[PDB]
Amino acid sequence: NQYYGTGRRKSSAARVFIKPGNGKIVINQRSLEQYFGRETARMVVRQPLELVDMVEKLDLYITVKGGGISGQAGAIRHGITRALMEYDESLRSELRKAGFVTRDARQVERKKVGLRKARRRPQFSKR
Amino acid sequence: RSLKKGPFIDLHLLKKVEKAVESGDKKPLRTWSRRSTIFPNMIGLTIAVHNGRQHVPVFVTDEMVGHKLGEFAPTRTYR
Amino acid sequence: AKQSMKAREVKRVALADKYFAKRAELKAIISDVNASDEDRWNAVLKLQTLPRDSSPSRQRNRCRQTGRPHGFLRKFGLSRIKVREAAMRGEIPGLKKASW
Amino acid sequence: ARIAGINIPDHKHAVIALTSIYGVGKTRSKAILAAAGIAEDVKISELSEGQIDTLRDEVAKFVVEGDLRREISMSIKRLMDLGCYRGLRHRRGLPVRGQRTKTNARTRKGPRKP
Amino acid sequence: PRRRVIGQRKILPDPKFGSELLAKFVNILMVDGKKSTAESIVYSALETLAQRSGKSELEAFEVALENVRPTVEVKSRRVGGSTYQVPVEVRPVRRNALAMRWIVEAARKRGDKSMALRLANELSDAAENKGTAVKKREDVHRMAEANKAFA
Amino acid sequence: QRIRIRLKAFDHRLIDQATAEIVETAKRTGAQVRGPIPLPTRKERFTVLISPHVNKDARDQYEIRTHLRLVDIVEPTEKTVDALMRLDLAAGVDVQISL
RNA sequence: GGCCGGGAACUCAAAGGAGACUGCCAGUGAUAAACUGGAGGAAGGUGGGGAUGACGUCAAGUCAUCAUGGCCCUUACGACCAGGGCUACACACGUGCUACAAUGGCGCAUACAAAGAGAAGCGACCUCGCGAGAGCAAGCGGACCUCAUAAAGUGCGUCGUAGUCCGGAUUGGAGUCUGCAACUCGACUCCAUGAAGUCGGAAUCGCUAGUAAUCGUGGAUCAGAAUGCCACGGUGAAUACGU
């Protein structure tokens, strides 16, 4: 059987399928080390499975598109959390107290008329 | 300016120069055309070129061939 | 704008409509490679005897209601002031104030 | 080593060292070394007399040093004598390629004079 | 501000080790949003520092901090038309912050070849009680001591 | 063969009305259809100065939205095609038929 | 290789609905209005950002967008035409871009976006040229074709603190394209040349979070001419004891 999850961050979307057995992760037809060359990103992707002791018990098949490196990592983490709750349904308290259940709604602020950026003003002189 | 197009000259100036050469002598040739190239067949003549107010006389030598007529009649006054 | 400038524009458009095909032919000759090298010279000498106002680059866009030469928008045929007046009166279909 | 009437350094790579001649830049340096058949990252102190003579023969094919200086000087003198717009600019000391003069122009004018 | 209360932002721990102090150090060292460069510099420095002393990187780091933390400082007051220096106590978060800032500022001013080498040298000197960071701590304490009459 | 219908408008209630009308006329003439598919809306934007003279801030910003729909008829017949070609709809909708 | 048969689950597209109200718990307070904390929940107390500008003030700005009372000129203060000027240059001030370097310069090769425009238009594949480009020619009024290859990043080498393999003003030679026409006065390409400048006196400016700082991308005006203006996303901080 399969358990599914959807995850989102800044501009990215991630689809996660999980099955039982023999921990192995595949992202966009590549391995974790092939895809993410950043230790921070790897740690972010692995955090929930370290939180619930199932690192060597589940197979993970993932797809992701949009955004950058950090945004994709966060989206994958969100999706894994949701799929794990679908799998068990009694880990919700621990995951919520860790803080992985929340969607992080921080987007980019628009530019505005008369400003150089969202909040930066041009230089002012009195005379 | 592209080389596949050839040099640029004004038709009236070209015809006047031809007539002057065939008929020999010439008093200054008056022109308002500062955008025309200087051809090898002008060497020896006197061309009076407009600058905004007056006609400046230029006596053509062979070190000028290939330039525009306007580069020999300045347009601003400064002291 | 004065009444003479609009007349200038009308005259320019008329001449440029009149002389369209001849200029295309001569420019095709000049641009094409492997020509006689005398036809090219004659074509260059002939392209400069046509009226100056027959070149489409002597034209300037103006507001259709006032004649203003600055602040022109192509979708509407008007300047900024008249665009705003019509938009607030409700005379431009589909247009309204935006936020996002 | 002496090449074109001047001493070129000894502890640099060949491609960088050859750019001490007046008239040789990076592209010409690379072309010269390709014709001579030497690598670009070999120090000049690790060469031999035959190799240096080959380099001299290669460099002889370009206009360098005093010949080039004479060419440029005559170029400018011609315009000054003719008395065209560019010549007048050259002999007044102002910009020649149409730049602004209400402000700036300091590379051609020098420091400010009150 | 005037009528406000501001909470504390959360900070992720380091990926190699598991401390938030080290993450704060990386942040204080970074420039222009380039976190990977700063991480590389810090890890190289800690590696070259642990060999010089035969102990763990975190242990060496703590030994360095304990020689730069301050205890008292001086604020400026002016109500009578003249400026007075008033001694006050520092609290632990500000102690850590000031020590880190001083260490990085001192390291940037050296004359070695690479930033990692400069940082390692500064940390070793601090562990031995030498350098600009320790001098700064001493100057601050001297100024605090000279003004005890105004406590 | 197949018939494709493309509809465009500045107002989505109007466009939906027209689409329902087309689907009904096709379905009552005994031809199977594949329900309307929404396609991305186009947003065009403009920005103007609102003072007859200098002031350079003080602008207004406007928009026009274009809505779009597609309908596919798989097995047409003579009666269905004639009925479609013999229809009139509202005065703000653009309809294009392709065979 | 979503390439082909298929599937309607998932990402996404765009139309109808649901949801957040101090609604529930405990304490404080005038048997109040409200305040401090807690549960659940994607989100909590105005959740984040826009649009929206009271009675009036400064005889504030605009008779050169337009409209208009009163003056003023009509073989002229009204028309038409070619050349020149608005681009000057001893000097003073405002707003910006590029730097003064190893958290970097140069070479090789390799991940990850968003939002837009297009018929006198956007111009693929292929051949020629070192390059700016040129020749011949599909497709597209577009979730289909084209503009169009993101950059900072990551791996491997080299340079070793020098006015330098840092910086790129200025000037000489040779060219391309738009356009009747590039002298005064266009943009871009190749070869050569290689200035000031080693962090800036008294003054002085912006910013409380996906903000400052840093990296690329698109549009209006437009034959051609952005370091300006208006929009889009990537990485991503420090500090707030207090008045």
Tab-separated table of N, CA and C (backbone and C1' of nucleotides) in Angstrom, chain D residues 12-13 21-25 27-28 75 86 89-90 96-97 99 101-102 106-109 112-113, chain G residues 88-93 158-159 164-165 169-173 183-186 191-195:
chain	number	residue	atom	x	y	z
D	12	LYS	N	57.611	34.593	-13.739
D	12	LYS	CA	56.214	34.531	-14.143
D	12	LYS	C	56.007	33.437	-15.186
D	13	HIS	N	54.742	33.101	-15.422
D	13	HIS	CA	54.397	32.224	-16.529
D	13	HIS	C	54.640	32.942	-17.853
D	21	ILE	N	55.674	43.655	-23.409
D	21	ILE	CA	56.055	44.337	-24.640
D	21	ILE	C	54.928	45.269	-25.059
D	22	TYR	N	55.297	46.457	-25.524
D	22	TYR	CA	54.340	47.464	-25.973
D	22	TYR	C	53.766	47.039	-27.317
D	23	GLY	N	52.600	46.400	-27.295
D	23	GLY	CA	51.961	45.950	-28.515
D	23	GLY	C	51.512	44.505	-28.475
D	24	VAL	N	51.717	43.833	-27.347
D	24	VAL	CA	51.316	42.444	-27.165
D	24	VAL	C	50.351	42.378	-25.989
D	25	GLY	N	49.122	41.936	-26.257
D	25	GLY	CA	48.151	41.636	-25.240
D	25	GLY	C	47.935	40.146	-25.074
D	27	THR	N	45.558	38.008	-26.310
D	27	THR	CA	45.293	37.221	-27.511
D	27	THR	C	46.572	36.987	-28.310
D	28	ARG	N	47.354	38.048	-28.521
D	28	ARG	CA	48.608	37.912	-29.251
D	28	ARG	C	49.584	37.010	-28.509
D	75	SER	N	50.001	59.330	-36.781
D	75	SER	CA	48.546	59.344	-36.885
D	75	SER	C	47.965	60.622	-36.300
D	86	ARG	N	38.348	66.759	-35.121
D	86	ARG	CA	39.131	65.926	-34.217
D	86	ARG	C	40.498	66.538	-33.943
D	89	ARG	N	40.127	69.311	-31.440
D	89	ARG	CA	39.947	68.769	-30.096
D	89	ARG	C	41.265	68.249	-29.533
D	90	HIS	N	42.054	67.564	-30.363
D	90	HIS	CA	43.322	67.012	-29.901
D	90	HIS	C	44.275	68.113	-29.459
D	96	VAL	N	37.242	63.863	-27.541
D	96	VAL	CA	37.233	63.765	-28.994
D	96	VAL	C	36.084	62.920	-29.528
D	97	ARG	N	35.473	62.065	-28.710
D	97	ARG	CA	34.442	61.144	-29.171
D	97	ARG	C	33.046	61.560	-28.707
D	99	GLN	N	31.801	63.232	-25.894
D	99	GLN	CA	31.332	63.142	-24.522
D	99	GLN	C	30.931	64.516	-23.983
D	101	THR	N	30.841	67.811	-21.557
D	101	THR	CA	31.842	68.687	-20.957
D	101	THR	C	31.286	69.675	-19.939
D	102	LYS	N	29.969	69.747	-19.748
D	102	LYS	CA	29.426	70.604	-18.699
D	102	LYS	C	29.882	70.135	-17.324
D	106	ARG	N	37.403	64.924	-16.748
D	106	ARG	CA	38.597	65.171	-15.956
D	106	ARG	C	39.797	64.350	-16.405
D	107	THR	N	39.598	63.204	-17.053
D	107	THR	CA	40.751	62.472	-17.564
D	107	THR	C	41.472	63.268	-18.639
D	108	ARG	N	40.741	64.060	-19.419
D	108	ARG	CA	41.355	64.888	-20.446
D	108	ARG	C	41.731	66.272	-19.939
D	109	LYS	N	41.044	66.786	-18.918
D	109	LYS	CA	41.323	68.138	-18.443
D	109	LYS	C	42.368	68.190	-17.333
D	112	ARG	N	41.024	69.923	-10.962
D	112	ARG	CA	40.319	71.195	-11.055
D	112	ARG	C	41.261	72.362	-10.792
D	113	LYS	N	41.036	73.462	-11.502
D	113	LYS	CA	41.829	74.682	-11.344
D	113	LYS	C	40.925	75.839	-10.937
G	88	A	P	27.641	70.037	-23.910
G	88	A	O5'	27.996	71.344	-24.742
G	88	A	C5'	28.861	71.290	-25.869
G	88	A	C4'	29.525	72.617	-26.148
G	88	A	C3'	30.564	73.057	-25.118
G	88	A	O3'	31.696	73.658	-25.747
G	88	A	C1'	28.850	74.694	-25.281
G	89	C	P	33.174	73.144	-25.381
G	89	C	O5'	33.416	73.662	-23.892
G	89	C	C5'	34.107	74.881	-23.641
G	89	C	C4'	34.318	75.143	-22.165
G	89	C	C3'	34.820	73.963	-21.335
G	89	C	O3'	35.675	74.437	-20.288
G	89	C	C1'	32.765	74.713	-20.465
G	90	A	P	37.191	74.899	-20.582
G	90	A	O5'	37.532	75.892	-19.387
G	90	A	C5'	37.284	75.519	-18.040
G	90	A	C4'	37.997	76.416	-17.058
G	90	A	C3'	37.711	76.136	-15.589
G	90	A	O3'	38.489	75.086	-15.050
G	90	A	C1'	37.415	78.429	-15.999
G	91	C	P	37.768	73.848	-14.328
G	91	C	O5'	36.567	74.519	-13.525
G	91	C	C5'	36.597	74.640	-12.108
G	91	C	C4'	35.705	75.755	-11.613
G	91	C	C3'	34.574	75.345	-10.682
G	91	C	O3'	34.988	75.146	-9.342
G	91	C	C1'	33.734	76.808	-12.334
G	92	A	P	34.495	73.858	-8.519
G	92	A	O5'	33.052	74.260	-7.977
G	92	A	C5'	32.881	74.802	-6.674
G	92	A	C4'	31.431	75.084	-6.366
G	92	A	C3'	30.540	73.872	-6.154
G	92	A	O3'	30.652	73.298	-4.866
G	92	A	C1'	29.471	75.364	-7.621
G	93	C	P	30.514	71.709	-4.680
G	93	C	O5'	28.945	71.440	-4.688
G	93	C	C5'	28.110	71.900	-3.636
G	93	C	C4'	26.649	71.799	-4.000
G	93	C	C3'	26.085	70.398	-4.145
G	93	C	O3'	25.793	69.770	-2.912
G	93	C	C1'	25.361	71.720	-5.957
G	158	U	P	47.549	23.750	-8.793
G	158	U	O5'	47.644	25.248	-9.320
G	158	U	C5'	48.318	25.551	-10.532
G	158	U	C4'	47.909	26.896	-11.078
G	158	U	C3'	48.300	28.104	-10.243
G	158	U	O3'	49.633	28.513	-10.487
G	158	U	C1'	46.031	28.288	-10.924
G	159	C	P	50.575	29.027	-9.297
G	159	C	O5'	50.122	30.536	-9.073
G	159	C	C5'	50.305	31.506	-10.091
G	159	C	C4'	49.472	32.741	-9.848
G	159	C	C3'	49.721	33.485	-8.546
G	159	C	O3'	50.848	34.346	-8.625
G	159	C	C1'	47.375	33.329	-8.996
G	164	U	P	50.907	47.270	-11.249
G	164	U	O5'	50.798	45.684	-11.184
G	164	U	C5'	51.810	44.912	-10.549
G	164	U	C4'	51.311	43.559	-10.100
G	164	U	C3'	50.420	42.808	-11.086
G	164	U	O3'	50.695	41.410	-10.998
G	164	U	C1'	49.269	43.090	-9.052
G	165	C	P	50.649	40.479	-12.305
G	165	C	O5'	49.098	40.363	-12.653
G	165	C	C5'	48.615	40.599	-13.973
G	165	C	C4'	47.242	40.006	-14.185
G	165	C	C3'	46.341	39.979	-12.951
G	165	C	O3'	44.969	40.111	-13.331
G	165	C	C1'	46.730	37.773	-13.689
G	169	A	P	35.638	52.085	-19.253
G	169	A	O5'	35.975	53.643	-19.251
G	169	A	C5'	35.786	54.411	-18.073
G	169	A	C4'	36.646	55.656	-18.016
G	169	A	C3'	36.932	56.402	-19.305
G	169	A	O3'	35.826	57.122	-19.814
G	169	A	C1'	38.842	56.417	-17.890
G	170	U	P	35.749	57.504	-21.373
G	170	U	O5'	37.237	57.903	-21.777
G	170	U	C5'	37.715	59.236	-21.667
G	170	U	C4'	39.177	59.341	-22.036
G	170	U	C3'	39.523	59.194	-23.510
G	170	U	O3'	39.335	60.384	-24.245
G	170	U	C1'	41.014	57.896	-22.208
G	171	U	P	38.832	60.327	-25.766
G	171	U	O5'	40.032	59.642	-26.561
G	171	U	C5'	41.074	60.421	-27.134
G	171	U	C4'	42.241	59.575	-27.588
G	171	U	C3'	42.084	58.821	-28.898
G	171	U	O3'	42.248	59.637	-30.041
G	171	U	C1'	43.077	57.409	-27.285
G	172	G	P	41.578	59.221	-31.440
G	172	G	O5'	42.568	58.127	-32.046
G	172	G	C5'	43.873	58.479	-32.489
G	172	G	C4'	44.652	57.288	-32.999
G	172	G	C3'	44.003	56.467	-34.100
G	172	G	O3'	44.103	57.053	-35.381
G	172	G	C1'	44.895	55.016	-32.469
G	173	G	P	43.040	56.675	-36.524
G	173	G	O5'	43.221	55.104	-36.742
G	173	G	C5'	44.198	54.600	-37.642
G	173	G	C4'	44.223	53.088	-37.696
G	173	G	C3'	43.083	52.402	-38.428
G	173	G	O3'	43.217	52.449	-39.837
G	173	G	C1'	43.530	51.256	-36.411
G	183	C	P	29.166	60.462	-39.789
G	183	C	O5'	29.729	61.694	-38.947
G	183	C	C5'	31.133	61.913	-38.844
G	183	C	C4'	31.488	63.363	-38.610
G	183	C	C3'	30.809	64.053	-37.439
G	183	C	O3'	31.450	63.778	-36.210
G	183	C	C1'	30.767	65.462	-39.347
G	184	U	P	30.595	63.646	-34.861
G	184	U	O5'	30.067	65.122	-34.593
G	184	U	C5'	30.940	66.149	-34.157
G	184	U	C4'	30.250	67.491	-34.134
G	184	U	C3'	29.038	67.607	-33.223
G	184	U	O3'	29.417	67.876	-31.884
G	184	U	C1'	28.553	68.557	-35.349
G	185	C	P	28.541	67.377	-30.637
G	185	C	O5'	28.153	65.872	-30.983
G	185	C	C5'	27.748	64.967	-29.960
G	185	C	C4'	26.797	63.906	-30.466
G	185	C	C3'	27.317	63.033	-31.606
G	185	C	O3'	26.709	61.744	-31.543
G	185	C	C1'	25.407	64.180	-32.329
G	186	G	P	27.521	60.452	-31.050
G	186	G	O5'	26.451	59.274	-31.150
G	186	G	C5'	25.148	59.439	-30.608
G	186	G	C4'	24.271	58.220	-30.788
G	186	G	C3'	24.821	56.890	-30.309
G	186	G	O3'	24.699	56.733	-28.904
G	186	G	C1'	23.729	56.626	-32.411
G	191	C	P	40.195	40.566	-29.579
G	191	C	O5'	41.331	41.469	-30.233
G	191	C	C5'	42.281	40.918	-31.133
G	191	C	C4'	43.254	41.959	-31.625
G	191	C	C3'	44.007	42.740	-30.566
G	191	C	O3'	45.068	42.016	-29.975
G	191	C	C1'	43.251	44.219	-32.237
G	192	A	P	45.443	42.259	-28.433
G	192	A	O5'	45.999	43.750	-28.399
G	192	A	C5'	47.279	44.059	-28.922
G	192	A	C4'	47.473	45.540	-29.162
G	192	A	C3'	47.637	46.436	-27.946
G	192	A	O3'	48.907	46.339	-27.330
G	192	A	C1'	46.227	47.489	-29.526
G	193	U	P	49.064	46.536	-25.742
G	193	U	O5'	48.601	48.033	-25.488
G	193	U	C5'	49.460	49.124	-25.779
G	193	U	C4'	48.796	50.447	-25.490
G	193	U	C3'	48.582	50.786	-24.022
G	193	U	O3'	49.735	51.346	-23.425
G	193	U	C1'	46.611	51.242	-25.260
G	194	G	P	50.316	50.753	-22.057
G	194	G	O5'	49.161	51.020	-21.002
G	194	G	C5'	48.616	52.323	-20.833
G	194	G	C4'	47.415	52.293	-19.929
G	194	G	C3'	47.664	51.674	-18.554
G	194	G	O3'	46.952	52.395	-17.548
G	194	G	C1'	45.905	50.538	-19.629
G	195	A	P	47.736	53.044	-16.306
G	195	A	O5'	47.006	54.436	-16.066
G	195	A	C5'	47.591	55.657	-16.495
G	195	A	C4'	46.702	56.829	-16.168
G	195	A	C3'	46.246	56.925	-14.716
G	195	A	O3'	47.181	57.607	-13.899
G	195	A	C1'	44.365	57.059	-16.135
